[PDB]
Design a protein around this ligand. Sequence first.
Ligand SMILES: COC(=O)c1cc(NC(=O)c2cccc(O)c2C)c2cc(C(=N)N)ccc2c1
Length: 238
Amino acid sequence: IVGGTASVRGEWPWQVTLHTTSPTQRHLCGGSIIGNQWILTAAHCFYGVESPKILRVYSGILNQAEIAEDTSFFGVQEIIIHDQYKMAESGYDIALLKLETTVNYADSQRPISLPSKGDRNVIYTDCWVTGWGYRKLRDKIQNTLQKAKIPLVTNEECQKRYRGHKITHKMICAGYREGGKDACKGDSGGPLSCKHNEVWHLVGITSWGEGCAQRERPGVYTNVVEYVDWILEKTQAV
Ligand SMILES: COC(=O)c1cc(NC(=O)c2cccc(O)c2C)c2cc(C(=N)N)ccc2c1
């Protein structure tokens, strides 16, 4: 996260840090708890990953330092990638992680509600992006979870900032014309929480952007509302 500040412990109870154990353990991506056994994250976070066995999901974490060899975590039983996904910049950058065990909700770890289709007309003016990502272009994973308040921009506005790209309605952007605040590498999979009428909603999933926090270069996120049907279908038992 560029231009943000340290979050308060438990401030974003749905935020998780996804680690890979190969070659040695490290933070890989952010993610959001949306169900007792489900983490919603970005598809492009599993590039080169051929098994959920090397994945570990840690919930209720503020500082990466809290994670040690003796820290409990949730194993991943299955990685579900949207079958239409090719690459972050082309859309469909969404994935579900089915946990091996159930998450016991508490003040430190709880789910974030998904957007309602009848909320596409809603104007979120209190949106935040969080993560342990880079604080600048060339940086490293941060110890303390960062947060930054960033305004959403219209797709037409976004498309105008990414002429060589195709900003579809399945994407949503957020940024300041002058830049300064934005998600970055390491925040991928992160949630783009917006609080509307005292209720937090998972509006987007950190996906991509040209550099980080550059002027006239909004962050691009997966437009979650466009995937509620997909999420429902994939999280069923059938
Ligand atoms: C794993 O995900 C990414 O590669 C990756 C690469 C990016 N864009 C870059 O240009 C970049 C930033 C830092 C280091 C780096 O090498 C690059 C190419 C990203 C930019 C944003 C955003 N601005 N909202 C968010 C997530 C990103 C994830």
